[PDB]
Amino acid sequence: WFCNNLIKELLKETRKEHTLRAVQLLYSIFCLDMQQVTLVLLGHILPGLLTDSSKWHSLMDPPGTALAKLAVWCALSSYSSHKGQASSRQKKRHREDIEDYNMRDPLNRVLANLFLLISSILGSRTAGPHTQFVQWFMEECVGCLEQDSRGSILQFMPFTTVSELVKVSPKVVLAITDLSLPLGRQVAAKAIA
Amino acid sequence: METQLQSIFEEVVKTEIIEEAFPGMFMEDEKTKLISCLAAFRQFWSGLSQESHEQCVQWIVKFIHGQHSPKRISFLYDCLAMAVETGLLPPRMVCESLINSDSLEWERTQLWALTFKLVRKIIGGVDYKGVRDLLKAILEKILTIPNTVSSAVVQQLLAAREVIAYILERNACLLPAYFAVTEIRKLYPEGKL
Amino acid sequence: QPLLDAVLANIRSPVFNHSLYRTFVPAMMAIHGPPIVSPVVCSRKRRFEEDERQSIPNVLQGEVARLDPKFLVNLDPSHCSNNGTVHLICKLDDKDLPSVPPLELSVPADYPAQSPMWIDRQWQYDANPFLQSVHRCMTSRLLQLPDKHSVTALLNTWAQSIHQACL
């Protein structure tokens, strides 16, 4: 409910600099609880924001781009295996959850779930906001020092989703040659088209 | 008077006839016949009380949207652009008569895209400060479209966003963009997403 | 002539519908004596599920079925889920000389319109002398079809123009 009410307060700005400062200070205020709050916020709100019908009405705003930027920032920061042991949170964070679905890890699984939701959000024939939202999210994810787009050599959808988004130039070059495997040949061919 | 121009353009534009599709040994229209009809109509409406040129252009733009004929519509659009090039059909009049009651969002989506591509061929719309009603009507036709149309007609409708992007970008060097700020009051009442 | 019953049934506006039963059903049940006039058993949950959820507009499917083995259409990176539903790559493989495939993106398959797209016109047709003459007469011929149809009509017109400008 903390992150939910914070996002509800953020999605009432209607001004660019306002949203920019808002997310800029939200990324900081999320510290000392990076992993847990990041995982919960992303894997709960972003699906609920992209799966409901009233949730679409709230993401059509320029705040949407700032929210996507905040999401990718928290994701990239939580991907780092830092300690981040807060004073009073190192104890109250002793809970258990299978997360209700590389290796098997909560953040590792939450990121895969978000990527799968992204690929499904390219599910055509009906979308106005949440195609624009994912387009802004991918553009924000296009950045240096990137460790996302997990990219296992076997079957990982992120590059299939990248080809699908390209169907929807440097953006394709983002996940162009990650593992230097024949997987890169696919995105290479799709960029050639 | 208007019926004379109507019959003339019908004989000019609708010069096609159902002619036994089986091949005859017989064998440009878009380069010579179009120019001839354009010059004939030019002489006519120059000697036909040009004060009614507004109603004439309204009749023409109404007749253009009557034929479904996607390819035949594009040819008529090139004809109208060339008629603009000869110093006739001032841009403000033709665009103000073309945008209203004829764009018909979702009625003829192909005609929507072709109309806005034609307007982009005259994207400058070189005229006086009378670009106000054009921008207002464009914003109106953009806002009369909900946020759940489809995911297959996106680029076909994106010609509106392209025209607005050109207008706002050139506003650094085309027209006073403060006039655009004061003209877009309909969309922002101090911020309404 | 015996309009009495008609005018009375017309006058009988009120919502309560039990007088006709009590007035007629006794006589009919006395004369006609069926314990079960319709002894067939009817217990129906009609609709279970009816959707393939993978179908593009069926009208286009009919045309792609009616196509000759010479023609063959496909799909490019598709903005064609349900609304445009088509921008194909039809290669006119035939006996005569080949050419470049057009896009031919059509409207909803109800077809109060035609296909013509003309996307690759820029570099493909200007590059070659023969391809330049192909475009010339073919445009004039397509400016004649009254309400052309997506696959069969436009594709046959394209093939005819390609093998006619060939001379």
CA of C103 vs chain A CAs: smallest distance (Å): 15
In chain A, whose CA is at the least distance from the CA of C82? A125
Contact A168 C81 (CB under 8 A): no
DSSP 8-class letter at C108 = -
User: Tokens for A113?
Assistant: 């779930």
In a 3-state reduction of DSSP, which class is residue A85? coil
Q: How long a stretch of residues is chain B?
A: 193
Q: Write the DSSP assignment of A88-152 as a string of letters.
A: THHHHT------------HHHHHHHHHHHHHHHHT--SS-SHHHHHHHHHHHHH--SS---S---
In a 3-state reduction of DSSP, which class is residue C56? coil
Query: Residue B38 and residue B41: Cα distance in Å, rounded?
Result: 5
Rounded to 5°, the CA angle C74-B72-B167 comes to: 90
Give the list of residues 6+ apart from residue A95 with CB closer than 8 angstroms, or none. Answer: none
> Phi/psi class of residue B141: alpha, beta or left (left: φ > 0; alpha: ψ in -120 to 50)?
alpha
| Residue B113 near residue B152, CB atoms below 8 Å | no
Q: Write the DSSP assignment of C127-140 as a string of letters.
A: H-HHHHHHHHHHHH
Chain A 174-193, residues with CB within 8 Å of chain C CB atoms? 193
Q: Is A54 on the interface with B (CB under 8 A)?
A: no
- What method was applied to determine this entry? cryo-EM
Give the list of residues 6+ apart from residue B168 with CB closer than 8 angstroms, or none. Answer: B177, B180
Contact C79 B30 (CB under 8 A): no
> Phi/psi class of residue C49: alpha, beta or left (left: φ > 0; alpha: ψ in -120 to 50)?
beta
Handedness of CA C108, C113, C114, C116 (dihedral sign): negative
Query: Residue C105 and residue B72: Cα distance in Å, rounded?
Result: 15
Query: Residue C103 and residue C86: Cα distance in Å, rounded?
Result: 9
State the maximum Cα–Cα separation within chain A, in Å, rounded to a whole number: 54
Rounded to 5°, the CA angle C135-C138-C139 comes to: 85
> Phi/psi class of residue B89: alpha, beta or left (left: φ > 0; alpha: ψ in -120 to 50)?
left
Q: Which of C127, C114, C110, C128 is nearest to C158 (CA)?
A: C114
Give residue ranges of B with CB < 8 Å to any C CB.
16-19, 23, 27-30, 68-72, 74-75, 108-110, 150-156
Query: Residue C56 and residue C81: Cα distance in Å, rounded?
Result: 7
Q: What is the dihedral of CA C108, C109, C112, C117, to 10 degrees?
A: 70
Q: Which of C95, C167, C87, C89 is nearest to C130 (CA)?
A: C167
Query: Residue A66 and residue A72: Cα distance in Å, rounded?
Result: 10
Burial class (CB in 10 A: 0-12, 13-18, 19+), A43: buried
Contact A15 B148 (CB under 8 A): no
Cβ contacts of A122 on chain C, cutoff 8 Å? none
Query: Residue B119 and residue B81: Cα distance in Å, rounded?
Result: 9
Query: Residue A125 and residue C83: Cα distance in Å, rounded?
Result: 7
User: Tokens for A64?
Assistant: 């949407």
Q: Where are the beta strands (DSSP E) in B20-127?
A: none
Q: Out of C84, C136, C146, whose CB is closest to B153?
A: C84
